[PDB]
Each structure stands twice: as C-alpha cells, then as structure tokens.
Design a protein around this ligand. Structure first.
Ligand SMILES: N[C@@H](Cc1c[nH]c2ccccc12)C(=O)O
Ligand SMILES: N[C@@H](Cc1c[nH]c2ccccc12)C(=O)O
Ligand SMILES: [Ca+2]
Ligand SMILES: [Ca+2]
Lengths: 468, 479
C-alpha cells in the first residue's frame, strides 16, 4: 500500500486541476447561497468510515452531488457578502507547491529558504506600504506571516501584557485595561479574554455617526484618564482601519499619539483595508504609523492570497519574542507565533508579488474601488435609496429610505435582502450600526466584473419595484 | 487586469502539477539537509518587489535554483528527523479543492457543507479510535479540526481556566496550577504562559529512566496534594502519548483517575502516536479515555494529511464554548440546545477557517481503515526491524524501548576512549553531512542519543537498510 506514488499522484492531480477549472468556469451558474437545511449531509454520508477503499470516481461524484450544492460559493462573481476572499492563479500555484513540499519551518535550520524568504517578503511588503525602517528586518523591526487577524492580535496583546507583568508582577493582571472600538465587538473582546484580561477591563469605546463610527480621540483620552485616575493600567488599544460592518477608520495619527503618551501599545488592524494602502491615494490612512506598535493586514482578504494569509509587523520584536517564550541574520519563526509548526507561508506571497507586480496590484485595488464608486453613484440616482455612511473603500452601505413605506424601515430592508438572497443570483449580508439597519455590497470577489455589478443593481431595482 | 482566468489557471496549475510530481520523483536525489549559510537568499533576491510583472519561467527557474536547494527535504525517503510529516495524493486533492473553493466557514450558514462534513468526519475518526459516545456530535461531546497542537492545548487550557474563574472569580488566577511532564517542556509551558498562568504555577513533573520517562502517577499525586495543602487550585494536566524526544507514554488510565479525583482537566496530547491508536494493538494506550477531558492528534504527523491538520475532541463542548466567547446572552443561558449544527468560529481562536475536513474525508474514503492501519503497521515494522539490526551490534545500545516508529539509540561508552557524548555527536554530524540522510538527536535523562523517526511517506524497506549500512560504515571510519 503506497499512499504517495509520483505517477498516480500526477494523474489524480491533473484530474483535480481540471475539476477546479471547471468549477471556476461554472460557479457563476450556481446559486451563491445554498438552500440546504441543517443536517442535510448527515442523511447522505454513511455514519462510519469505510473499512475498504473507495474509488475516486465515487468520491468526485459525491462531491458534485452533496458537497458543492451544499456550499456557499465565495468565488462566485455574484458574491458580495462580508468581505471577498480574493484569489489569483499565482497564489494557487504557491499553495500547491508549498503544500507539496510540506516542510515545517519552525527554525531556520528546519528549512532555510522558507525562513529567509519570509523575511524578504515581509520587507518587500513593508516597502510597498512605505512603512518606516523600524518595521523591517533590514532595519530595526520585523514581521511574521500568521494565519489570522485574531491570533496576530492575541500575540500583540500578550506581548503588551507580558511587558506590563514583568514591570509590575503577575498580580498586576487585574489592573490592565484594553480598549477597542465598539465596532470591533465580535472579536476584540474574545481575544482579550483568551489572554486573561479581566472581563470588566475590556473597554469598548462608544462611537457615533458624527465620527463615521470611528474612534473619537477625545473619548478615548477621557476613558484612559479616568482609568489612570482610578489606578488601572492602560495596556493595549486596537485601532481598526476598516471595520467589518461599515469600514469605519479609526484615526491612526491621533490615536497613536494618545497611545504613546500613556504607554499604551497600539495595534492597527487593517485586515481588509490595509491592502488599499499600497496605493498612494490611500496611504494617508497610515499617517502616524511610525508611532504605532504593531500593524496587521490580511492578504487573503483583499490581496489575491488564498486563506490563510495574515501579515503582522512589529516595531519592537524583542517584546513579542520575550512574551512568547519561557526562557544575527536569521530568525526561528516558532518564536513569533503561538505554535511550533508552520507551512512555507511566504512562497505564495512571493509568487503574487513577482507574477503581477506592484502596478497590477494597485490596478486591482483601484478596479474594485472604481466598481464600488460606480455602484454608489447608481444608488444616489434612485431617490428611494440612501447611502447610510461614507464609502471609503470597496464596501457600499445602503438602504431603502424610511419614507418609501409606512412599515418599519428595518423590516422593509430585511425583506429586500431576503428577496435578493432567495433569488440565488446574489449573496449580500446586512449590518446594524447606530441603530440603523443597512444592506452592504462588498465588491471585490476575484471573478466579479463590471457587468456583474450592473446586473446586481438591476436586480435590486427590480425587486424593489416588486416590493413597493 | 484579471488575476483569475479559468483557462490560464488550468494551464499554469497543470504545469505546477508536473513540476511537483517531478520533485516527488527526484527528491531522493537531493541532499536531505541543506548546506546554505544564514542569509544566503538575501544575495539572490532583489531588495524590493518589482513594479512590472515577471514571467513564470523566470520564477520557476529561481525556485529550482534558489529555493529548493535551500530547503530541508522533509519529503525525502531519507528524512528521519523529528517526526515525519506524512502525505498522500488523496490529501493533496483535498488541499487543492479546499483551497480552490476558498470558503470561509466561520458559521454553518457561511457554508453548510464545510461545517457538516467536519462534524461527520470527526465522528468517523472518533469511532475508528473507538472513543466513547461522549466525544461525538452524534452523542454528547464534539470535536473540531484545528491547525496545531499548540492551539488545541491552548484552547483546552483556557476552557479549564475559565471554568475555574467563573467558579472562583478572576483574582483566583494566581492559584491555578498546571501540570505537565518534563518530557514536554518546550511547548506546554509556553502554552500555559499564553493563557496567563502565573510563571510559578506551571509545574513540570520529573521523570526517570525507571518509568521510561513517562509520568509516574504517584509523583503527580504527591505534587497535586502538596499544591492543595498550600492552597493552590490544580487546574490542568497535559498527559502526553508519545513525547517528541523518545515517544515516552504517560499512563492515561491512572492519570485520568487522578484528574477526576482532584477536579483537574486532563488533556491527552497524542499529536504523533494517537494516529497509531487506529490499530487494535495500540488502542490500549487510550484505555481510560472515557475519564479524560480532551484529546488531540495531528493527521499532518502520522496520518497522511499535509500540514496543517490537528483533530481535537472535547467531552464537554459547552465548557469550551463558554471559554471562547464574551457573548453575554450565550453565557447567561446555562443549558443544552436543540440545534443540530455548529458555528466552528466558537470552537477556535479565530473567526475565519478553511474547508479543513475535506482532505480528511478524502483520506478516509480513498484508503479505508484497513489500509490506514496497514500504513501505521508498515512504519512500526520498519522501525522494529531497524531496532533489531541495532541490537545485533554490540557497539550500539537501545537507550529506551521503541514504542512506535521512533528508535532511540547510541554508541556504547566503551567503544571509544573519547567521551560517549562526543562520539555520538560526531557520528550524527558525519551522517547528516553525507547529504544522504537527516537525523536529529536528543538529550534525555542526561543521556545523548540519536533518533530514527521512520515514517516519511516515500521511505521503503531498502532505504532503512541503506541508512543502517551507512551508519555502520561511518562508525567503522570513526574508530
Ligand atoms: N516533534 C518534533 C518535530 C515537530 C514539531 N512540530 C511539528 C509539526 C509537524 C511535524 C513535525 C513537528 C520537535 O521536537 O520539534
Ligand atoms: N469578515 C467576516 C468574517 C471573516 C473573517 N476572516 C475572513 C476572511 C475572509 C473573508 C471574511 C472573513 C465577517 O464580517 O464576519
Ligand atoms: Ca476585481
Ligand atoms: Ca511508509
């Protein structure tokens, strides 16, 4: 019994490549969101694994018949929910090869090219973002490719916690206060809690439509000063560049000043919008980055990398390294993350950069921003709709105005979202901000072209005519 | 600019398939361990990314010329270091497809098939491991596919911590004590520190050659009772089934009885050896698993999955779920619910997730339980054979019993007038310098030993034979 034989591998893999290309060619045809009910797959797969081998033909048949029809097609050109997970063939080749090599790069020794290429690729990316040398290995800082935003933030939070605890002792853990926008409320508190921050020391900064739901420096300063007056230790601040709901932007320039002033570790989460900062017209959003303690952004969101791919830059690596242990030209990346093992994470990023070039990456950002701009202009031309909050990037938040119906505005927009999604011809999610229910169009799915967005607007108007 | 066009994709991906198959076909030819010096790759790549696109031909050339020669070839049939990362074409198909679909399965709604198939696969595997129904979604427990052992252990540690903190209040964190074998002192303490365990409340249980460096239950009981007497709260016990150094085995049956007695959450780390427990002649290592709080094993170690793939089962998911959320509404309701479907974001550190279960499903379906057992047995048989060869040479000695696929051995001290440790270190260095083999060493109980970690998917019987021949030749040269 040979699980890996090169020629059998070659045959089966070519067949899978063709199946995948056929899927990319057909997905526009499938309903974006699936109609299966919960538990449907339990009635279609046996309850125990087979003693005996099954032929690959049977498996592929079952995938087409029971798995894919049960999928939400994130790759559909008509997927506009959450944030697109953007892709590219260069990145897929990087994934294929990095997996096939299947190395574990916990140390430079356990695979030198992997570690060195990660350092190089992180410095490349730093230079495209025009970050100070204080974030670069060639300079005084560094970076690491993590899997997620959640674990990157957990790492920076633990670094800050450990600096505090070594200064003041472990029993000071009950004094440490962490701050995040009320717009990061489904992930930032979870991360703090994982780290042992007391429940009442996780503080959500209230925000209003008056700041476009970005953190108001005044508000955070008042909170920090009340906490210091009460004897607490302000420790960590998550500034979000592009919230998941409306892509609000916290002001890095002023918030980093408050952080520096109070010894607060400031981390900028730009999982989605950070990628736009490769374009000079978006780079002002990172003004003040030189004062910032850490920054992260997710290529597997808006930069053509598949899941997983999150970049984390740190200005003072030694604090992170100290935090993550119980005791030159190269690093051992096990020290920059939670676990020991690691894939060859940097290969696909290298392949993306080399294959496409900064020019095309900028073109790609700008093309998505242009299609969202166009869609917003369409929305403004229809007096029944309104843009609820400013479009800063690729996401348009919009809704039916209260005066189009005598029923509750929320119920009317919920019904419209339902009609749209039940069509199968589009997937969009909603959000609630400042008590206002709104629809979102998150433009960016790699296969989306301009006519897809045109057709979505046409569908929205058709269903709204039917609805009113 | 179209980063994704189906036909260009088809072309380039076919080309990469042919390249990858050629690498699998030729890797035995490359030196296993690389000779590059630190910083070698900086002198061969530009300091900045290019403005304009580069042709794929140039990139492939650079991968052949600057990357692969800088790799440690984990896929070589002559790689015997650490623990092998075993692979299979079924799993590679799962990786390709899981990636191409590029779904984000944070909730059931965000892709039903991904979540449902994960539940089914975890129950399949649980049954092959003959775990009680208390670890199954079809029963009263559950499981999740994580990336690593470190984050699985971290999650169970936080679950235990939060059970304590909700009982006693947050300021009691300074009383919570975690216990682990001194044979797991590189990963386990780091994890405890990450969860906020006070530095002095992370306790390594001393082990001796008298128990083959497995945890002595008596030792642990004495430690726990002294901690209770001093007012501490015993919280978490990490029992290791197959330590990284010598694949020592902590006794699940007695240790779990102790965990139950003192209210300690016991987690069984079976990253490597757990896969072997799919074979009846190894299932005894899980005797007592019904008393255990959580269990993990890594398919990307010994079950033909590529990196990453770690399976985690939990007997009381609600403790994990409470631990991993701040949601006031979920935390106020203290009951079990009628839902038949989960949102796996609640079972992990992050929100997003790949379609992780697909490749495991394809492994199980494509090979069958019988063949998977055959694979385990094949690696164990090659290791037993290698041990038998070593015992036939009176210059060498087996330092600790071979429990699975890893053989720990050394040159006896009396074979040379030099210090035994230096003699064995010189032998290891010569071996690795050959380029025809890679082995790591370990120090356990003050004893320096070489390790042979058999299992790399391309390794066949003649490879082990030739490694042993080489070892003997280099030993002859060395004396
Ligand atoms: N257990 C070995 C090797 C190892 C660690 N983590 C891994 C993950 C996958 C494969 C092998 C490993 C060690 O001491 O580091
Ligand atoms: N951002 C998504 C969830 C998410 C996490 N990671 C992602 C990566 C890609 C796309 C979406 C995600 C949300 O609003 O809940
Ligand atoms: Ca696009
Ligand atoms: Ca084998």
């Amino acid at each position: 019994f040979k699980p890996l034989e090169a020629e059998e591998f070659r045959k089966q893999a070519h067949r899978m490549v063709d199946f995948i290309a056929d899927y990319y060619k057909n997905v526009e045809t499938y309903p974006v969101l699936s109609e299966v009910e919960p538990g449907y797959l339990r009635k279609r797969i046996p309850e125990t694994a087979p003693y005996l081998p099954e032929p690959l033909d049977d498996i592929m048949k079952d995938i087409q018949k029971d798995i894919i029809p049960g999928m939400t097609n994130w790759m559909s050109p008509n997927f506009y929910a959450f944030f697109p997970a953007t892709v590219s063939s260069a990145a897929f080749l990087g994934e294929m090869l990095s997996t096939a090599l299947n190395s574990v790069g916990f140390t430079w020794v356990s695979s030198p090219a992997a570690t060195e290429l990660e350092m190089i690729v992180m410095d490349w990316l730093a230079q495209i973002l025009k970050l100070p040398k204080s974030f670069m290995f060639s300079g005084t800082g560094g970076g690491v490719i993590q899997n997620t935003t959640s674990e990157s933030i957990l790492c920076t939070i633990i670094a800050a916690r450990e600096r505090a605890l070594e200064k003041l002792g472990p029993d000071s853990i009950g004094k440490l206060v962490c701050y995040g926008s009320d717009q990061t409320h489904t992930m930032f508190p979870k991360t703090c809690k994982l780290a042992g921050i007391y429940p009442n020391n996780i503080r959500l900064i209230p925000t209003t439509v008056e700041t476009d739901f970005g953190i108001s420096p005044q508000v955070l300063r008042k909170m920090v000063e009340d906490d210091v007056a009460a004897g607490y230790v302000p420790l960590f601040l998550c500034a979000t560049l592009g919230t998941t709901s409306t892509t609000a932007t916290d002001p890095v320039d002023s918030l980093s000043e408050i952080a520096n002033e109070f010894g607060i570790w400031i981390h900028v989460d730009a999982a989605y919008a950070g990628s736009a900062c490769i374009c000079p017209e978006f780079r002002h959003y990172l003004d003040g980055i030189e004062r910032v303690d850490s920054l992260s952004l997710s290529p597997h969101k808006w930069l053509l990398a598949y899941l997983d791919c999150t970049c984390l830059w740190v200005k003072q690596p030694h604090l992170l390294l100290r935090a993550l242990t119980t005791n030159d030209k190269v690093v051992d990346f096990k020290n920059w993350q939670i676990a020991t093992g690691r894939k060859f994470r940097s290969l696909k990023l290298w392949l993306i950069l080399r294959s496409y070039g900064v020019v095309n990456l900028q073109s790609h950002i700008r093309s998505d921003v242009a299609m969202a701009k166009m869609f917003e202009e369409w929305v403004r031309s229809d007096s029944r709709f309104e843009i609820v909050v400013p479009r800063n990037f690729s996401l348009v938040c919009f809704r039916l105005k209260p005066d189009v119906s005598s029923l509750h505005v929320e119920e009317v927009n919920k019904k419209l979202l339902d009609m749209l999604n039940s069509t199968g011809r589009v997937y969009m999610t909603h959000t609630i901000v400042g008590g206002i229910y709104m629809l979102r169009l998150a433009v960016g799915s790699s296969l989306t072209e301009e006519h897809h967005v045109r057709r979505v607007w046409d569908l929205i108007q058709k269903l709204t005519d039917d609805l009113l």
